[PDB]
Design a protein around this ligand. Sequence first.
Ligand SMILES: *[C@@H](CC(=O)OCC)[C@H](C[C@@H]1CCNC1=O)NC(=O)[C@@H](CC(=O)[C@@H](NC(=O)c1cc(C)on1)C(C)C)Cc1ccc(F)cc1
Ligand SMILES: *[C@@H](CC(=O)OCC)[C@H](C[C@@H]1CCNC1=O)NC(=O)[C@@H](CC(=O)[C@@H](NC(=O)c1cc(C)on1)C(C)C)Cc1ccc(F)cc1
Ligand SMILES: [Cl-]
Ligand SMILES: [Mg+2]
Ligand SMILES: [Mg+2]
Lengths: 184, 181
Amino acid sequence: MKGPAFEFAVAMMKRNASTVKTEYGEFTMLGIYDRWAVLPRHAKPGPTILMNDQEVGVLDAKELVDKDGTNLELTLLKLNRNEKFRDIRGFLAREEVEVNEAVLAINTSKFPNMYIPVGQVTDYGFLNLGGTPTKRMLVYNFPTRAGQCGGVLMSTGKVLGIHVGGNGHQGFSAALLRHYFNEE
Amino acid sequence: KGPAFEFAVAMMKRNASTVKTEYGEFTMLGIYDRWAVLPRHAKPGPTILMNDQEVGVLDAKELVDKDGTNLELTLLKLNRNEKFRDIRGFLAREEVEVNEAVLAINTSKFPNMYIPVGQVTDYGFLNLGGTPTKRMLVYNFPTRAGQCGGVLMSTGKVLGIHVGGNGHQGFSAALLRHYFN
Ligand SMILES: *[C@@H](CC(=O)OCC)[C@H](C[C@@H]1CCNC1=O)NC(=O)[C@@H](CC(=O)[C@@H](NC(=O)c1cc(C)on1)C(C)C)Cc1ccc(F)cc1
Ligand SMILES: *[C@@H](CC(=O)OCC)[C@H](C[C@@H]1CCNC1=O)NC(=O)[C@@H](CC(=O)[C@@H](NC(=O)c1cc(C)on1)C(C)C)Cc1ccc(F)cc1
Ligand SMILES: [Cl-]
Ligand SMILES: [Mg+2]
Ligand SMILES: [Mg+2]
């Protein structure tokens, strides 16, 4: 609900977010640093994506799992483009973030530049999501809709995670942690 | 953009509802007492569905200027016991222009969504949906069906109500203080 959180969110989406289509559907994508970006794992990007209606090559993809192989529901993508993202790694936490007030930001054809005050975010942990055991889920209560996956969950100076699932009035993000961007 | 969003979220929580008529689903802003506003195109009947509940309409006034020109707003007096928080002090005497506005929507398609639409210009006259219409405010963003009744706001100001557009251009009817007496 906070002004500064929305101010932060809008600036973040303007600088680093895009609309991406894969063979599996349309998503919000967040650039992280250099040419590295993130999508929900179920976006299932191939060797070419559509980024703001433009064909972009994918040079590497990394589907994130924990040390025991459990799904984290995020895929990191290295893009064949010459433009670089603003390095936003400093806005990513070392561990799953909780906040009193978060904003979920969506950038797709269905929801072009929409911001939703989702209220409190709780570190929920384990969830069987779409039939897949998944960890490091953040939960929040708002009226969820199809097409919001990839939405960026934020608060002032904080990128918490990426929207990946939900049902009815409950939404879940995969926590977006800083160490995910280290080879190890 | 921050202060505009903060003002907008509080306004919607307190004064906005979702309304269904034969002509679709709308965001509806309550103004004071039992008086609310809808786009004229909503064409409310003697009853409306407000947050999924049947609510009687006691009076409906389709606003026109002194020469009968469409303003694209209908004021409705609702048969409800609850009074709206009085927000008339946030309404200007004339059409407002700002560098940064937020458009706020609350429907089943767009439940509690806020859009940074940037600059708002007093465009004036427009032939909208075939009807000559005045006091149009214009802003540039990717417009969508189901956003009518959306509340256009800036820091400490309610500017207008979304009534139309096409492609990447949206229009609000200016919400002027004198409309409410
Ligand atoms: C986003 C995907 C999308 O629409 O992109 C365009 C192709 C979508 C968002 C949810 C739909 C309804 N509300 C949402 O927030 N995500 C999905 O559809 C994932 C699957 C789910 O969310 C399931 N939900 C649950 O399992 C669930 C469990 C609980 C307690 O709450 N929800 C569906 C039954 C809706 C996609 C997905 C994610 C991860 C996977 F391993 C497989 C599939
Ligand atoms: C909201 C009402 C609704 O029922 O949802 C759509 C079915 C809707 C919003 C616009 C739809 C697309 N973009 C929008 O912002 N409003 C309308 O559909 C009105 C009609 C229009 O907006 C027309 N647009 C124009 O005439 C126009 C002209 C210019 C320069 O830019 N746009 C349509 C061609 C989209 C409803 C309306 C208003 C007044 C009337 F007299 C009749 C109908
Ligand atoms: Cl009545
Ligand atoms: Mg193909
Ligand atoms: Mg400007």
